[PDB]
Amino acid sequence: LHRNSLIVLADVALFLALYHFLPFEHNVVLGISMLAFIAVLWLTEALHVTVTAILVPVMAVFFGIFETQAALNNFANSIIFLFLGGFALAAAMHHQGLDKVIADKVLAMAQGKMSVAVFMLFGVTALLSMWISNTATAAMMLPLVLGVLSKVDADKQRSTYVFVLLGVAYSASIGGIATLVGSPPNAIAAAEVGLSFTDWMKFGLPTAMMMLPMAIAILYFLLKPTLNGMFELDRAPVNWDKGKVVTLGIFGLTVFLWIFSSPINAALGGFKSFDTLVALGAILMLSFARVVHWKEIQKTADWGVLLLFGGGLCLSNVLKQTGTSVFLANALSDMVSHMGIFVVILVVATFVVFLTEFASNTASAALLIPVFATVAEAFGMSPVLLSVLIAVAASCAFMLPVATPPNAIVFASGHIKQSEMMRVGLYLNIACIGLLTAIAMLFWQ
Amino acid sequence: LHRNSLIVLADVALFLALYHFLPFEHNVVLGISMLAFIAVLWLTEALHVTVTAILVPVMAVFFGIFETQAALNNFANSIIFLFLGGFALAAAMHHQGLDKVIADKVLAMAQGKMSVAVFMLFGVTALLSMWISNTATAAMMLPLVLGVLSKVDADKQRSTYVFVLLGVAYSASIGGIATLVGSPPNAIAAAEVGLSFTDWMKFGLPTAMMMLPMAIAILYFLLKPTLNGMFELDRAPVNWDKGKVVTLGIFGLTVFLWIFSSPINAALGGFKSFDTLVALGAILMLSFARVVHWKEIQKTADWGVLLLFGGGLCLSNVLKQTGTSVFLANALSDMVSHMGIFVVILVVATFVVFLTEFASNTASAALLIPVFATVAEAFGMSPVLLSVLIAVAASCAFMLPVATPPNAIVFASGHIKQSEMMRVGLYLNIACIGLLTAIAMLFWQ
Ligand code: NA
Ligand code: NA
Ligand code: NA
Ligand code: NA
């Protein structure tokens, strides 16, 4: 009937074939077949990643791996509520116009010169993507880009549009790498291997600061924009007012608590998920101040991402319970011994960066982090390096518009060519592979 | 600054006063103060009920009652996912126009006579409210009511409008009482005292069938409509097509599995939350058939209700853990001994029915079911009768437009008077009190 339905049926056939024709233990066979089924579903997007995540507990229970409540309890992890609080913050900013105010103030700090407005556009895009999202950030920044570029004759200077546009999209995708919020893959890794907000920040903030300038330089030295004119924005200067200040103060307090959780928590009793508690407190403070309402929060939040978090966690639990992780570790011990950690991370980064171009970053991270984590635990090899590397690589999607929402959004303008986008993404992917490998070897080891 | 903020501050002061000036055990004092705080917040709607629910785990953790993960695990109960699957079903029906088709076919079964079209309008409204919702049902039925009543001269026959309108609203509110889905209070009671879909159906289906005709008769004998004309609907007759049939088949299969879970589950291994598994399977089947997509499901679903379920469950757990339930039971043992179960249920039903007029049905049920349940467990007195009675009474809101969304929606037309609505709701509330008391004493004991 449809390609998606045929893919689902073929995946079912593959599951049955592995179930009946695998000479391993029953539990290992079940886990491997389930892993292949979920992998095909997520990568091919035959069903929505959230629907597949909902399926994971169902076929875990029906095959006698977990009880229903135990399987469903993976959907209430503290990380999910942390990222819900992140959604609440972003909804408040959008409702109050804080993001627009910040962008306008930065572009005002640019007097009239487009030579610097584009670069500060990239910087503010990354800053917003730390907190709000990768998609909404690019969506709201695009009109600003077009307004700045309204006087540059977009028939003969299309290279400048490609610059200011792909830079914004990549800046959003990279700013999502700096914070636990901003990119769902970071949440998946943190949930898998117990990473706090500041623990992830110490990992992803230098990476983002070192990759964004590299991406901009690659763009500039691949395609040559002029960047010598001036821009006179027609939009009026939006000023500060009550509610924006309160939202900014709540945001700053929440960030301060997230950063200094460890001393604060040590001074309050030692709560287990203080970051999640702070996120919920942020929700409560915003509601009390009446700067955002639950209807806006609900509309802004992507609950499918949270359900996908739960599904990935359930898959990791299934792999750990069935012995599939340790079985794969025993199988791969010889290979990993022959070829060392440097090349292990090299190939992992290459695979993830070149896979997220075709597959969703969140689904790819949810699929791979459990595997390389539970397997790594069987090697010892604390599964923080691989999980964080996989999340960052998944966030690093640059070659195709379908790869990432902001890429598609910026491609919708019509001023960008498939060939140019693919080649720029190729060079950036190679550079990101090198940078991530070096970072993991040096700073993390 | 604002009444809501002042209410929150006064509630904080009350919490501190109870915390410092209660001569009970520390845990009992903490539980009682927390109960009062949450009660005031929910009843006054100073903060959104969902926000208060999110607050419940936060102030449970910060006061050393539960660990963060244990407190948050109450938000992943199987009941929540059951009602999520109900949302998925409703979204599919709305997307495919199944509800509109059903209503049109029924009104076609009425040749042209409004004497019976109104009554079948009530019946179909209740049937849809069993599954879809109380609010969306009335919202989509109202245009049909106005179309039927477009030829009745709404300046001198306003009584007929009040009839056909309040009947639709009450029919929706009552149809929500027949199934576990349809009314969040039913979900709260089922989660509290482990009730299956058919277990609740055996409770709420006779109640709805016995209350809806009573409500219609009270309406007819209080206000006198003519109901002698004819209606010629301008809208074209929408016919069946591929996708509606598939959605109807999936809905029927899901209902069949929900009804016959106990034999089926006994024949498959004895899964713990087979109803929730069936709901998730319904989501999967709908997605596979491509009759609904996650974006429509997300837009349709009210995730605040699910979070409120989690918050109420956490409150019940807090009461059980702190000994507040047993302390209240010991305090009230003398009173409940002096005055028997008949009058206990009488006063409980009176309080709930006359409270849901001012307070949201879901929040009132979430507040009261934990109290009268955990307290009842301390008496023995299996807390099914009281929980189900409270849920039904909460669903029974008829006096004020602000009481229930469908009441407000039907009041938005402008053909209904506050005085008439209040008096009709008063008589219906009295009759519902009597009916619920009799049902609980006779069928349940
Ligand atoms: Na982001
Ligand atoms: Na992608
Ligand atoms: Na309903
Ligand atoms: Na109400």
GROMACS .gro file of C-alpha atoms in nm, chain A residues 22-369:
model
  348
   22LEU     CA    1   1.964  -1.694   1.590
   23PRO     CA    2   2.175  -1.956   1.777
   24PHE     CA    3   2.210  -1.755   2.100
   25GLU     CA    4   2.035  -1.749   2.435
   26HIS     CA    5   1.663  -1.672   2.425
   27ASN     CA    6   1.703  -1.338   2.604
   28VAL     CA    7   1.994  -1.230   2.384
   29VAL     CA    8   1.804  -1.325   2.069
   30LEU     CA    9   1.498  -1.133   2.189
   31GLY     CA   10   1.704  -0.824   2.267
   32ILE     CA   11   1.891  -0.832   1.936
   33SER     CA   12   1.573  -0.877   1.733
   34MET     CA   13   1.403  -0.597   1.926
   35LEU     CA   14   1.705  -0.372   1.871
   36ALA     CA   15   1.701  -0.435   1.496
   37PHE     CA   16   1.325  -0.375   1.478
   38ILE     CA   17   1.342  -0.045   1.666
   39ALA     CA   18   1.653   0.061   1.474
   40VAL     CA   19   1.487   0.014   1.136
   41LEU     CA   20   1.171   0.190   1.252
   42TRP     CA   21   1.354   0.492   1.395
   43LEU     CA   22   1.603   0.532   1.111
   44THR     CA   23   1.348   0.488   0.831
   45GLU     CA   24   1.082   0.701   1.007
   46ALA     CA   25   0.818   0.454   0.888
   47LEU     CA   26   0.636   0.536   1.212
   48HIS     CA   27   0.689   0.853   1.412
   49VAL     CA   28   0.984   0.816   1.647
   50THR     CA   29   0.749   0.885   1.937
   51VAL     CA   30   0.514   0.609   1.821
   52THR     CA   31   0.808   0.368   1.802
   53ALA     CA   32   0.910   0.478   2.152
   54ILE     CA   33   0.559   0.399   2.276
   55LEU     CA   34   0.593   0.063   2.101
   56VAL     CA   35   0.916  -0.021   2.287
   57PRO     CA   36   0.748  -0.078   2.628
   58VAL     CA   37   0.457  -0.263   2.466
   59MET     CA   38   0.674  -0.527   2.299
   60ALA     CA   39   0.901  -0.536   2.603
   61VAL     CA   40   0.604  -0.631   2.823
   62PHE     CA   41   0.442  -0.871   2.576
   63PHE     CA   42   0.772  -1.064   2.548
   64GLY     CA   43   0.811  -1.096   2.926
   65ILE     CA   44   1.104  -0.861   2.986
   66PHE     CA   45   0.944  -0.605   3.219
   67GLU     CA   46   0.616  -0.552   3.397
   68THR     CA   47   0.395  -0.280   3.253
   69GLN     CA   48   0.448  -0.029   3.534
   70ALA     CA   49   0.823  -0.088   3.547
   71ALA     CA   50   0.850  -0.035   3.171
   72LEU     CA   51   0.637   0.281   3.183
   73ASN     CA   52   0.832   0.426   3.477
   74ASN     CA   53   1.111   0.509   3.230
   75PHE     CA   54   0.889   0.789   3.094
   76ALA     CA   55   0.895   0.979   3.426
   77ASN     CA   56   1.270   1.026   3.454
   78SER     CA   57   1.390   1.348   3.615
   79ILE     CA   58   1.558   1.446   3.288
   80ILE     CA   59   1.221   1.457   3.111
   81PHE     CA   60   1.088   1.711   3.362
   82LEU     CA   61   1.412   1.910   3.340
   83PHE     CA   62   1.358   1.947   2.966
   84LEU     CA   63   0.991   2.027   3.029
   85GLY     CA   64   1.107   2.317   3.245
   86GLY     CA   65   1.332   2.420   2.959
   87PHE     CA   66   1.023   2.427   2.738
   88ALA     CA   67   0.849   2.644   2.997
   89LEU     CA   68   1.138   2.891   2.994
   90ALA     CA   69   1.137   2.904   2.614
   91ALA     CA   70   0.760   2.954   2.607
   92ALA     CA   71   0.791   3.246   2.848
   93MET     CA   72   1.061   3.408   2.635
   94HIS     CA   73   0.857   3.371   2.317
   95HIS     CA   74   0.540   3.497   2.486
   96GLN     CA   75   0.715   3.807   2.623
   97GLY     CA   76   0.925   3.876   2.314
   98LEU     CA   77   1.251   3.844   2.507
   99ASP     CA   78   1.426   3.667   2.219
  100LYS     CA   79   1.317   3.935   1.971
  101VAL     CA   80   1.431   4.207   2.212
  102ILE     CA   81   1.773   4.043   2.252
  103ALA     CA   82   1.820   4.007   1.877
  104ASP     CA   83   1.711   4.366   1.812
  105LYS     CA   84   1.944   4.501   2.082
  106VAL     CA   85   2.238   4.308   1.934
  107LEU     CA   86   2.163   4.428   1.581
  108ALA     CA   87   2.142   4.779   1.728
  109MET     CA   88   2.486   4.730   1.881
  110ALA     CA   89   2.572   4.694   1.515
  111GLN     CA   90   2.536   5.054   1.402
  112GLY     CA   91   2.454   4.984   1.038
  113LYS     CA   92   2.731   4.753   0.920
  114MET     CA   93   2.636   4.412   0.781
  115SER     CA   94   2.999   4.297   0.811
  116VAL     CA   95   2.939   4.241   1.183
  117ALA     CA   96   2.559   4.204   1.195
  118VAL     CA   97   2.579   3.859   1.035
  119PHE     CA   98   2.840   3.738   1.285
  120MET     CA   99   2.643   3.866   1.584
  121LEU     CA  100   2.338   3.708   1.421
  122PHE     CA  101   2.523   3.377   1.439
  123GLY     CA  102   2.625   3.439   1.799
  124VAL     CA  103   2.279   3.535   1.922
  125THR     CA  104   2.131   3.241   1.730
  126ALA     CA  105   2.364   3.005   1.917
  127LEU     CA  106   2.288   3.175   2.250
  128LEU     CA  107   1.913   3.137   2.197
  129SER     CA  108   1.954   2.779   2.076
  130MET     CA  109   2.123   2.698   2.407
  131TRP     CA  110   1.784   2.739   2.576
  132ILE     CA  111   1.489   2.777   2.338
  133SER     CA  112   1.540   2.521   2.061
  134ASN     CA  113   1.719   2.460   1.733
  135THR     CA  114   1.406   2.490   1.518
  136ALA     CA  115   1.213   2.778   1.677
  137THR     CA  116   1.535   2.979   1.698
  138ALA     CA  117   1.604   2.957   1.325
  139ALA     CA  118   1.236   3.011   1.247
  140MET     CA  119   1.224   3.341   1.436
  141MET     CA  120   1.572   3.450   1.321
  142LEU     CA  121   1.504   3.398   0.949
  143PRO     CA  122   1.286   3.711   0.911
  144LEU     CA  123   1.566   3.913   1.071
  145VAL     CA  124   1.815   3.768   0.822
  146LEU     CA  125   1.591   3.856   0.529
  147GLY     CA  126   1.536   4.207   0.665
  148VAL     CA  127   1.911   4.260   0.697
  149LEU     CA  128   1.963   4.120   0.346
  150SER     CA  129   1.670   4.308   0.188
  151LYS     CA  130   1.913   4.550   0.017
  152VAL     CA  131   2.169   4.316  -0.138
  153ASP     CA  132   2.006   4.222  -0.471
  154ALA     CA  133   1.945   3.850  -0.428
  155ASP     CA  134   2.000   3.745  -0.789
  156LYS     CA  135   2.374   3.810  -0.822
  157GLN     CA  136   2.477   3.803  -0.453
  158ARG     CA  137   2.313   3.471  -0.364
  159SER     CA  138   2.639   3.364  -0.199
  160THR     CA  139   2.583   3.622   0.075
  161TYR     CA  140   2.235   3.483   0.137
  162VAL     CA  141   2.375   3.130   0.158
  163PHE     CA  142   2.634   3.259   0.406
  164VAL     CA  143   2.396   3.447   0.637
  165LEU     CA  144   2.140   3.164   0.610
  166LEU     CA  145   2.341   2.844   0.651
  167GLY     CA  146   2.541   3.020   0.921
  168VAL     CA  147   2.221   3.086   1.116
  169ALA     CA  148   2.102   2.728   1.076
  170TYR     CA  149   2.437   2.579   1.177
  171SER     CA  150   2.466   2.828   1.464
  172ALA     CA  151   2.133   2.707   1.601
  173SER     CA  152   2.231   2.341   1.560
  174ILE     CA  153   2.562   2.410   1.736
  175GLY     CA  154   2.413   2.621   2.015
  176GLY     CA  155   2.196   2.321   2.093
  177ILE     CA  156   2.521   2.139   2.178
  178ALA     CA  157   2.624   2.381   2.455
  179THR     CA  158   2.352   2.303   2.713
  180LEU     CA  159   2.161   2.000   2.833
  181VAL     CA  160   1.851   2.181   2.709
  182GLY     CA  161   1.857   2.292   2.347
  183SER     CA  162   1.909   1.949   2.196
  184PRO     CA  163   1.717   1.631   2.291
  185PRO     CA  164   2.024   1.413   2.224
  186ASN     CA  165   2.200   1.583   2.514
  187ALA     CA  166   1.906   1.493   2.738
  188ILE     CA  167   1.924   1.132   2.620
  189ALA     CA  168   2.294   1.106   2.702
  190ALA     CA  169   2.248   1.274   3.040
  191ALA     CA  170   1.963   1.040   3.131
  192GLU     CA  171   2.165   0.737   3.023
  193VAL     CA  172   2.482   0.815   3.220
  194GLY     CA  173   2.367   1.049   3.496
  195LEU     CA  174   2.506   1.386   3.385
  196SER     CA  175   2.403   1.711   3.550
  197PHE     CA  176   2.344   2.042   3.375
  198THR     CA  177   2.691   2.178   3.456
  199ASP     CA  178   2.846   1.837   3.390
  200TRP     CA  179   2.716   1.852   3.033
  201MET     CA  180   2.800   2.222   3.008
  202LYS     CA  181   3.168   2.159   3.082
  203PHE     CA  182   3.155   1.911   2.791
  204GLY     CA  183   2.951   2.091   2.526
  205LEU     CA  184   3.025   2.459   2.583
  206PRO     CA  185   3.392   2.449   2.473
  207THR     CA  186   3.292   2.219   2.188
  208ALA     CA  187   3.033   2.468   2.062
  209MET     CA  188   3.264   2.767   2.105
  210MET     CA  189   3.537   2.584   1.910
  211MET     CA  190   3.309   2.451   1.634
  212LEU     CA  191   3.096   2.757   1.555
  213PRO     CA  192   3.390   2.979   1.445
  214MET     CA  193   3.526   2.685   1.248
  215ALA     CA  194   3.193   2.649   1.067
  216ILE     CA  195   3.177   3.022   0.990
  217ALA     CA  196   3.535   3.022   0.861
  218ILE     CA  197   3.467   2.719   0.641
  219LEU     CA  198   3.157   2.891   0.501
  220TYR     CA  199   3.345   3.214   0.430
  221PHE     CA  200   3.643   3.040   0.268
  222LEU     CA  201   3.426   2.803   0.061
  223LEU     CA  202   3.174   3.059  -0.065
  224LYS     CA  203   3.283   3.423  -0.087
  225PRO     CA  204   3.040   3.688   0.040
  226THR     CA  205   3.112   4.059   0.014
  227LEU     CA  206   2.970   4.188   0.345
  228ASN     CA  207   3.043   4.556   0.284
  229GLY     CA  208   2.700   4.723   0.265
  230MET     CA  209   2.469   4.868   0.528
  231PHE     CA  210   2.122   4.776   0.652
  232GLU     CA  211   1.846   5.010   0.772
  233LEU     CA  212   1.583   4.797   0.947
  234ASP     CA  213   1.227   4.926   0.913
  235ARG     CA  214   1.103   4.757   1.231
  236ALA     CA  215   1.069   4.988   1.529
  237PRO     CA  216   1.302   4.944   1.829
  238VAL     CA  217   1.118   4.729   2.082
  239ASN     CA  218   1.200   4.842   2.436
  240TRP     CA  219   1.202   4.674   2.775
  241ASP     CA  220   0.884   4.652   2.980
  242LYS     CA  221   0.745   4.477   3.286
  243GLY     CA  222   0.737   4.101   3.236
  244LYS     CA  223   1.044   4.080   3.015
  245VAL     CA  224   1.261   4.189   3.308
  246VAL     CA  225   1.090   3.939   3.539
  247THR     CA  226   1.129   3.661   3.283
  248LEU     CA  227   1.497   3.747   3.239
  249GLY     CA  228   1.549   3.746   3.615
  250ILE     CA  229   1.381   3.407   3.654
  251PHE     CA  230   1.590   3.273   3.366
  252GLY     CA  231   1.910   3.403   3.523
  253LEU     CA  232   1.821   3.260   3.863
  254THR     CA  233   1.742   2.922   3.706
  255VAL     CA  234   2.073   2.921   3.519
  256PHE     CA  235   2.259   3.021   3.836
  257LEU     CA  236   2.100   2.736   4.031
  258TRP     CA  237   2.170   2.490   3.750
  259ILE     CA  238   2.536   2.593   3.738
  260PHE     CA  239   2.589   2.597   4.117
  261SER     CA  240   2.366   2.299   4.202
  262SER     CA  241   2.647   2.091   4.352
  263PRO     CA  242   2.744   2.336   4.631
  264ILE     CA  243   2.384   2.450   4.680
  265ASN     CA  244   2.255   2.093   4.688
  266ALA     CA  245   2.535   1.990   4.924
  267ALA     CA  246   2.422   2.279   5.146
  268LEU     CA  247   2.052   2.179   5.142
  269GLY     CA  248   2.053   1.803   5.206
  270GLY     CA  249   2.176   1.636   4.889
  271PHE     CA  250   1.874   1.604   4.662
  272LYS     CA  251   1.911   1.353   4.382
  273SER     CA  252   1.780   1.550   4.081
  274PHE     CA  253   1.835   1.908   4.193
  275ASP     CA  254   1.851   2.023   3.831
  276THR     CA  255   1.504   1.882   3.766
  277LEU     CA  256   1.380   2.038   4.090
  278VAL     CA  257   1.519   2.374   3.974
  279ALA     CA  258   1.344   2.335   3.638
  280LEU     CA  259   1.012   2.265   3.808
  281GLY     CA  260   1.072   2.560   4.039
  282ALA     CA  261   1.127   2.771   3.730
  283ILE     CA  262   0.788   2.660   3.600
  284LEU     CA  263   0.633   2.754   3.935
  285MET     CA  264   0.803   3.094   3.947
  286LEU     CA  265   0.697   3.179   3.592
  287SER     CA  266   0.337   3.081   3.669
  288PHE     CA  267   0.340   3.280   3.993
  289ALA     CA  268   0.476   3.589   3.815
  290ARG     CA  269   0.207   3.541   3.547
  291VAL     CA  270   0.458   3.578   3.262
  292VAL     CA  271   0.344   3.256   3.089
  293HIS     CA  272   0.043   3.025   3.107
  294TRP     CA  273   0.010   2.651   3.071
  295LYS     CA  274  -0.167   2.681   2.735
  296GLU     CA  275   0.140   2.850   2.585
  297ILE     CA  276   0.366   2.598   2.759
  298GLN     CA  277   0.162   2.308   2.620
  299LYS     CA  278   0.159   2.453   2.269
  300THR     CA  279   0.535   2.517   2.276
  301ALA     CA  280   0.642   2.185   2.428
  302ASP     CA  281   0.709   1.880   2.210
  303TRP     CA  282   0.582   1.594   2.424
  304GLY     CA  283   0.682   1.342   2.159
  305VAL     CA  284   1.043   1.418   2.247
  306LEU     CA  285   0.975   1.335   2.612
  307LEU     CA  286   0.802   1.009   2.518
  308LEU     CA  287   1.098   0.930   2.292
  309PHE     CA  288   1.329   0.985   2.590
  310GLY     CA  289   1.124   0.731   2.782
  311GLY     CA  290   1.135   0.484   2.494
  312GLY     CA  291   1.511   0.510   2.458
  313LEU     CA  292   1.557   0.460   2.832
  314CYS     CA  293   1.332   0.154   2.816
  315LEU     CA  294   1.539   0.017   2.528
  316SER     CA  295   1.858   0.064   2.730
  317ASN     CA  296   1.697  -0.115   3.025
  318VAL     CA  297   1.590  -0.399   2.796
  319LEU     CA  298   1.944  -0.438   2.662
  320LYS     CA  299   2.089  -0.440   3.014
  321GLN     CA  300   1.830  -0.688   3.142
  322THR     CA  301   1.854  -0.935   2.854
  323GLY     CA  302   2.233  -0.961   2.860
  324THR     CA  303   2.252  -0.835   2.502
  325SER     CA  304   2.492  -0.558   2.603
  326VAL     CA  305   2.740  -0.795   2.768
  327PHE     CA  306   2.703  -1.048   2.486
  328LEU     CA  307   2.789  -0.781   2.229
  329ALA     CA  308   3.077  -0.668   2.450
  330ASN     CA  309   3.221  -1.020   2.459
  331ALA     CA  310   3.180  -1.047   2.081
  332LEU     CA  311   3.348  -0.709   2.017
  333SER     CA  312   3.624  -0.740   2.279
  334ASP     CA  313   3.863  -0.884   2.022
  335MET     CA  314   3.792  -0.609   1.769
  336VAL     CA  315   3.819  -0.325   2.019
  337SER     CA  316   4.147  -0.477   2.140
  338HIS     CA  317   4.293  -0.493   1.788
  339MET     CA  318   4.185  -0.135   1.710
  340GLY     CA  319   4.221   0.128   1.978
  341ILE     CA  320   4.007   0.396   2.137
  342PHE     CA  321   4.123   0.671   1.901
  343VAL     CA  322   3.995   0.486   1.594
  344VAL     CA  323   3.688   0.367   1.787
  345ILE     CA  324   3.579   0.725   1.849
  346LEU     CA  325   3.684   0.822   1.496
  347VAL     CA  326   3.456   0.563   1.335
  348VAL     CA  327   3.174   0.630   1.582
  349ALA     CA  328   3.183   1.004   1.511
  350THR     CA  329   3.201   0.946   1.135
  351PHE     CA  330   2.905   0.709   1.144
  352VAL     CA  331   2.691   0.938   1.359
  353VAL     CA  332   2.764   1.261   1.171
  354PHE     CA  333   2.701   1.098   0.833
  355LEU     CA  334   2.392   0.917   0.968
  356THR     CA  335   2.217   1.219   1.120
  357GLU     CA  336   2.203   1.370   0.771
  358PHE     CA  337   1.947   1.103   0.674
  359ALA     CA  338   1.802   1.020   1.017
  360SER     CA  339   1.663   1.242   1.290
  361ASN     CA  340   1.926   1.348   1.542
  362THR     CA  341   1.712   1.260   1.844
  363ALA     CA  342   1.616   0.914   1.717
  364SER     CA  343   1.972   0.833   1.611
  365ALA     CA  344   2.105   0.937   1.952
  366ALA     CA  345   1.832   0.742   2.131
  367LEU     CA  346   1.921   0.433   1.927
  368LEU     CA  347   2.300   0.452   1.957
  369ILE     CA  348   2.361   0.591   2.307
   0.00000   0.00000   0.00000
